[PDB]
């Protein structure tokens, strides 16, 4: 129970309570992240509704814009034999 | 995968949390860095921050910064409804071509 | 036509019309047009992340690797760094290195050699040329020089 | 215009008891304030990003909303305005000095 | 090698002759590398008070 | 100004059934085409302040 | 025309318009245009 | 205007550095001799320019 010799040691209940109290903001943040990721690959919220006869094709404009920016932002780190210069 | 677990003893996968934060130890009011690890309901680690910098071992960088906010805003936030309109027009064109008689 | 008119009026009201990291030379740094300065705005945040990772690792290296490991990796004398001042990064700067940075650093060293080549003695010039050779990935010429 | 010629400026921030105890012999009257209530901050004027239902359960990490009156006030009564600072949490004054900067 | 170590420790030039052999422990650290891992935003719960 | 920036609140288009509610973010576009050119000067040199 | 308008508006909102390995010299390394840096991203 | 803001921040920090950092900290950061700046004239920024 008392792993350390501190004059005031946190208990697992306290840490768990702090995590639970801090969870909701991170839940909202991950809701936004999930929405962005769903828009990225056209699934979930952005999934076009499939009805018989009509099409369900959704161009991935967000993915196109993201792929036209992944490469220019990663090359600077991969151009030199030594990454960090001090 | 949810149905994967090593059958042997010392390879079993468990989900361990880690509380990297500041907590006053001596009770004098000076917050001193601490760490803590618990699996399930049993505490298995509690020390001071071993790293010399005395800070949380996480590095967070935003893509498009939010004014006076820790987290950042991604790219698909402004691109909203543009994909919707463009997809709804491409689907209309494909509907026009396919629901016809060729 | 109304969308075009409103876009032009807004762009006239506010003169903002729609439409190379490191100690890089002047031409590359001046070649940045519109949206290149916007891609650099994200590349710099990504670079700051990597710099933070690098300094976190460098701080950890001073207390976890023993003398033997470092004298084996570098094959030079071990330099002791005081543990008390390890929380300040006082005398070490860390940043990512790219090909353009390497080229410009080599040119700067060449310029320094050209400038101070006859005033100072041979040791300084030789050390500068050895650094140039190290940038060119010739670790043997550096020792021979 | 001219912020240099402004006689006061009140600023709010989310401080905790640990921050106040970081530098002692500067903050007085630190015992009148409630420090163990686990009550989320309810100030209707300070707008921040902290969720309304977040508050640290322990004692010296509790989030409180402290104001700060940075301004000029004549102290000696002779009419010469001398820079002063002041910090109060809720209704209790905890700091009053001259401008240290 | 031991002669050099002794000279660096004390400062007396001294050569060595092997008498026998002892048996020491030695807490070698086999792996001593830093780890940088990209973490999932579902796993990190950062304090929401950090304005 | 902030509501105009992100098309919400006062500038939120009214949602009625059948008709659309898409509002292009011209203000945000103009602001993003000016955030970057105004921030690079501070981030171009290894030393920020020169005295 | 609506597809073109939406593409242009998205490209204006986010300034990303659509469209040599080793210790190589400056000219070849600077000749890389768009999608060449994307081919290098796989070549690496 | 953005640069003037950063210059004001820089001079505010530089003025604060003269009275809060002890000699040892500065001689450790710079590894050169400590130069004393008189405290009375610190409200004028007489012999230091920042940008």
Half-sphere CA count of F13, side-chain side, radius 13 A = 10
What CA–CA distances, in Å, run from H33 to E7, E14, F51, H25, H29?
Answer: 36, 42, 18, 12, 11
Q: In Å, how far is B61's CA from the nearest CA of chain G?
A: 19
What six digits make up the tokens of H50? 């920042």
What is the token pair recorded at B60?
């967070």
Q: Give the chain F residue whose CA is nearest to the CA of C9.
A: F26
Taking alpha carbons only, the member of F19, G24, D46, A37 closest to residue C98 is: G24
Cβ contacts of residue D53 below 8 Å, gap of 6+?
A: A21, A24, D40
Interface of E with D (CB under 8 A): 48-49, 51
Residue keyed to tokens 């690792």 = C57
Check A36 against B77: CB less than 8 A apart.
yes
Write down how long chain A is.
86
DSSP character at residue D15: E
DSSP-assigned beta bridge partners for residue D74: D81
Place of tokens 């920036």: F5
Structural contact between residues A57 and B87, judged by C-beta atoms closer than 8 angstroms:
yes
C-alpha B16/C-alpha B39 separation (Å) is 5
d(CA D28, CA A1): 37
Give the C-alpha separation, F44 to C41, whole Å. 11
Report d(CA C22, CA C44) in Å as an integer.
10
Chains in contact with chain B (at least 3 beta-carbon pairs closer than 8 A) = A, C, D, E, F, G
Report yes or no: A68 at the G interface, CB cutoff 8 Å: yes
Best to test chain D binding among B19, B21, B23, B24 (most D CBs inside 10 Å): B24
Planar angle of CA D23, B55, D88, nearest 5 degrees: 30
Q: How many CB atoms lie within 10 A of CB A64?
A: 16
Q: In the structure, do chain F and chain A come into contact, i.e. share 3 or more CB pairs under 8 Å?
A: no
Q: How far apart are CA D33 and CA E49, in angstroms?
A: 20
Q: Which of C22, C42, C137 sits opposite A81 (nearest CB)?
A: C137
D71: β partners = D8, D84
Contact predicate C89/C59, CB 8 Å: yes
Question: In whole angstroms, what is the distance from residue H51 CA to residue H44 CA?
Answer: 16
In C, minimum Cα distance to G15 occurs at C35
Q: What is the 3-state secondary structure (H, E, C) of G1-44?
A: CHHHHHHHHHHHHCCCCCCCCCCCCHHHHHCCCCCHHHHHHHHC
Nearest-10 crossing angle of helices A61-70, G2-13: 40
Chains that touch G (3 or more CB pairs under 8 A): A, B, C, F
The CA distance from B72 to B76, in Å, is 12
E22 is written with which tokens? 């002892």
Are the beta carbons of B58 and E44 separated by less than 8 Å?
Answer: yes
Structure obtained using: cryo-EM
| List of residues 6+ apart from D64 with CB closer than 8 A | D14, D15, D16, D17, D33, D41, D89, D90
C-chain CB neighbours of E29 within 8 Å are 64, 66
- Name D96's bridge partners: D86
The residue in chain G having the minimum alpha-carbon distance to the alpha carbon of residue C103 is G26
Q: CA B23, CA D60: separation in Å to the nearest integer?
A: 8
Radius of gyration of chain D (CA): 16
The set of residues, in sequence order, having a beta carbon less than 8 Å from that of C119 and lying 6+ positions away, is none
How many of the other CB atoms lie within 10 Å of CB of F42? 12
Report the side by side order of strands in the sheet with D8-16.
D8-16, D63-74, D81-89, D92-98
Q: Please indicate whether, in this complex, the C-beta atoms of D14 and E48 are within 8 angstroms of each other.
A: no
Helix (H, G, I), strand (E, B) or coil at D36: coil
According to DSSP, the residues that pair with B73 across neighbouring strands are B64
**Tokens found for residue A55:** 């099409």
End-to-end CA distance of chain G: 39
Helices B82-98, G2-13: crossing angle, 10 deg rounding: 160
Instruction: Kindly tell me the burial class for residue A53, based on how many C-beta atoms sit within 10 Å of its own C-beta (0-12, 13-18, 19 or more).
Output: exposed
CA G9, CA A22: separation in Å to the nearest integer?
38
According to DSSP, the residues that pair with A84 across neighbouring strands are C96
d(CA D65, CA D81): 28
Kindly report the CA angle at G30 between G27 and G33, in degrees rounded to 5? 130
| D44 in Cβ contact with D86 (< 8 Å) | no
Beta bridge partner(s), residue D12: D67
**C53:E32 CB<8 A:** no
Which structure tokens are listed for A37? 């990721």
Q: How many residue contacts between C and G have a Cβ separation below 8 Å?
A: 24
Gap between the Cα atoms of H26 and H31, Å rounded? 8
C62·B62 Cβ contact <8 A: no
Which segments of chain A does DSSP mark as H helices, in order?
Answer: 12-41, 61-70, 75-78
Q: D50: exposed, middle or buried (C-beta count within 10 Å: 0-12, 13-18, 19+)?
A: buried
Cα dihedral C107, C113, C115, C121 in deg (nearest 10):
170
Q: For residue B32, list its beta bridge partners.
A: B23
In DSSP terms, which residues pair with C95 in a beta bridge?
A85
Contacts of A74 in chain G (CB under 8 A): 41
Cβ within 8 Å of residue C88, ≥6 positions away: H28, H29
H20: Cβ contacts below 8 Å, ≥ 6 apart: none
Would you mind telling me the total number of residues written for chain B in this entry?
A: 102
Residues of B whose CB is below 8 A from G7: 86
Question: Coil, helix or strand for D8?
Answer: strand
Look up tokens 């300070």; give the residue. Answer: D46
> What is the SS3 assignment for chain C?
CHHHHHHHHHHHHCCCCCCCCCCCCHHHHHCCCCCHHHHHHHHHHHHHHHHHHHHHHHHHHHHHCCHHHHHHHHCCCCCCCCCHHHHCCCCCCCEECCHHHHHHHHHHHHHHHHHCCCCCCHHHHHHHHHHHHHHCCCHHHHHHC
| Partners of residue H7 in chain F, C-beta under 8 Å | 49
Paired residues of D66 in beta bridges: D13, D89
**DSSP states of B39-53 as a string?**
ETTEEEEEEE--STT
Say what the alpha-carbon torsion angle B57, C59, C44, C29 is, to the nearest 10 degrees: 180
Structure tokens at C21: 């990291």
DSSP SS3 for B19: coil
> For chain E, what's the residue count?
51
Mapping DSSP onto H, E and C, the string for D73-93 reads: EECCCCCCEEEEEEEEECCEE
Phi, psi of B32 (to 5 degrees): -115, 135
Outline where DSSP puts E strands in D6-62. 8-16
Q: Does D57 contact A10 at a Cβ distance shorter than 8 Å? A: no
What is the nearest CA distance from B33 to chain D, expressed in angstroms? 13
Burial class (CB in 10 A: 0-12, 13-18, 19+), B96: exposed
Q: How far is CA E42 from CA A31, A33, B38, E38, in A?
A: 10, 10, 18, 12
Angle between helices F26-35 and C36-64 in degrees, nearest 10 = 60
Given an 8 Å threshold on Cβ–Cβ distance, is G17 in contact with C19?
yes
For tokens 């949390």, name the residue.
B17
> In angstroms, what CA-CA distances link C67 with B85, B97, C38, C60?
63, 73, 44, 14
Rounded CA separation A72/G16 (Å):
11
CB pairs under 8 A between B and D: 20
Q: What is the resolution of this structure in A?
A: 3.7
- Say how far apart CA C43 and CA F32 lie, in whole Å: 16
Q: Give the Cα separation of B82 and C117 in Å (integer).
A: 61
How far is residue D91's CA from residue C21's CA, in Å, rounded to a whole number?
Answer: 52
Cβ-proximal residues to F9 (8 Å cutoff; 6+ apart), any chain: F3
Contact present, E49 and D54 (Cβ < 8 Å): yes
Q: CA gyration radius for chain C?
A: 23
Inform me whether the C-beta atom of residue A10 falls under 8 Å from chain D C-beta atoms.
yes
Q: Strands B16-18 and A84-85, how do they pair?
A: unpaired
Q: Which residue has the tokens 């970057």?
A: F36
Helices C99-115 and C122-135 pack at an angle, to 10 degrees, of 160
**What contacts H14, CB < 8 A, 6 or more positions away?**
F51, H45, H48, H50
Write out the two tokens for F25: 């973010």
- Closest CA–CA distance from residue B101 to any residue of chain C (Å): 36
Two structure tokens written together for B62? 């935003």
Structure-token pair, residue H36: 């004393």
Picking from D66, D88, D54, the residue whose alpha carbon sits closest to that of residue D15 is D66
Contact F22 B81 (CB under 8 A): yes
- List % helix, strand, coil for chain E (3-state, nearest 5): 15, 0, 85
Q: How far is CA B10 from CA B17, D27, H45, in A?
A: 19, 54, 66
Buried b (16+ CB within 10 A) or exposed e, B23-32: bbbeeebebe
- For residue A59, which of G19, B86, G15 has the smallest C-alpha distance? B86
CB atoms within 10 A of CB G2: 11
Q: Which residues contact A80 (CB under 8 A, 6 or more apart)?
A: C96, C97, C98, C99, C101, C102
Q: Do chains F and G touch (3 or more CB pairs under 8 A)?
A: yes
**Dihedral over alpha carbons A75, A76, A82, A86 (to 10 degrees):** -160
Residue for token pair 């102290």: D75
Cα F39 to its chain centre, rounded Å, is 15
Residue B102, Cβ density class (10 Å: 0-12 exposed, 13-18 middle, ≥19 buried): exposed
In degrees rounded to 5, what are phi and psi of residue H19? -115, -10
Structure tokens at D75: 């102290």
Structural contact between residues C40 and F38, judged by C-beta atoms closer than 8 angstroms: no
CB-CB under 8 Å, B68 with E46: no
Which residues from chain D sit within 8 angstroms of residue E48, using beta carbons? 49-51, 54
Per the listing, tokens 């209530």 go with D37
CA D62/CA D60 separation, integer angstroms: 6
Say yes or no: E45 contacts chain C, CB-CB below 8 A.
no
Distance, CA of A23 to CA of A30 (rounded, Å): 10
Whether B90 and chain F come into contact, CB under 8 Å, resolves to no
Report the alpha-carbon distance of residue E5 to residue E24 in Å, rounded.
18
């Amino acid at each position: 129970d008392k792993l350390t010799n501190w004059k005031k040691e946190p208990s697992i209940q306290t840490l768990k309570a702090d995590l639970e109290a801090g969870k909701p903001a991170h839940d909202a943040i991950m809701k936004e992240i999930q929405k962005w990721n769903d828009l990225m690959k056209a699934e979930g919220s952005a999934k076009p509704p499939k009805v018989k006869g009509r099409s369900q094709v959704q161009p991935k404009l967000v993915r196109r814009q993201a792929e036209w920016r992944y490469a220019p932002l990663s090359e600077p780190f991969l151009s030199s034999p030594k990454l960090f210069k001090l | 995968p949810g149905d994967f677990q090593f059958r042997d003893a010392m390879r079993k996968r468990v989900i361990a949390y880690e509380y990297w934060g500041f907590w006053d130890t001596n009770g004098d009011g000076e917050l001193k860095p601490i760490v803590a690890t618990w699996i399930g309901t049993t505490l298995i680690r509690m020390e001071e921050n071993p790293y010399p910098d005395g800070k949380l071992p996480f590095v967070l960088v935003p893509y498009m910064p939010r004014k006076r906010e820790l987290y950042g805003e991604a790219d698909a936030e402004l691109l909203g409804d543009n994909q919707k309109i463009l997809g709804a027009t491409m689907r209309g064109m494909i509907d026009l071509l396919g629901r016809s008689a060729n | 036509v109304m969308s075009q008119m409103q876009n032009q009026e807004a762009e006239a009201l506010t003169g903002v019309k729609a439409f190379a990291y490191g100690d890089v030379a002047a031409g590359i740094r001046g070649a940045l047009d519109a949206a290149s300065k916007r891609e650099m705005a994200i590349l710099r945040r990504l670079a700051k992340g990597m710099a933070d990772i690098g300094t976190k690792i460098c701080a950890m290296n001073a207390v976890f690797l023993s003398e033997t490991e470092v004298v084996r990796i570098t094959n030079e004398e071990y330099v002791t760094i005081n543990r008390e001042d390890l929380k300040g990064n006082f005398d070490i700067e860390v940043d990512i290195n790219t090909a353009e940075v390497d080229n410009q650093k080599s040119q700067d060293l060449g310029f320094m050699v050209q400038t101070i080549g006859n005033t100072v003695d041979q040791q300084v010039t030789l050390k500068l040329v050895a650094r140039i050779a190290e940038l060119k990935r010739m670790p043997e010429l550096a020792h021979e020089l | 215009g001219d912020l240099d010629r402004a006689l006061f400026a009140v600023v709010s921030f989310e401080t905790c008891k640990a921050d106040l105890l970081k530098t002692p012999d500067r903050y007085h009257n630190l015992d009148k304030i409630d420090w163990e209530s686990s009550s989320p901050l309810t100030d209707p004027d300070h707008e921040s990003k902290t969720p309304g239902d977040f508050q640290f359960r322990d004692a010296m990490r509790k989030r409180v909303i402290a104001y700060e009156y940075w301004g000029f006030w004549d102290t000696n009564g002779d009419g010469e305005l001398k820079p002063i600072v002041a910090t109060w949490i809720g209704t209790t004054l905890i700091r009053m000095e001259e401008n240290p900067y | 090698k031991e002669a050099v170590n002794y000279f660096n420790e004390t400062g007396e030039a001294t050569y060595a002759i092997q008498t026998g052999t002892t048996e020491v422990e030695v807490e070698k650290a086999v792996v001593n590398r830093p780890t940088v891992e990209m973490l999932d935003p579902n796993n990190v719960v950062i304090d929401p008070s950090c304005n």
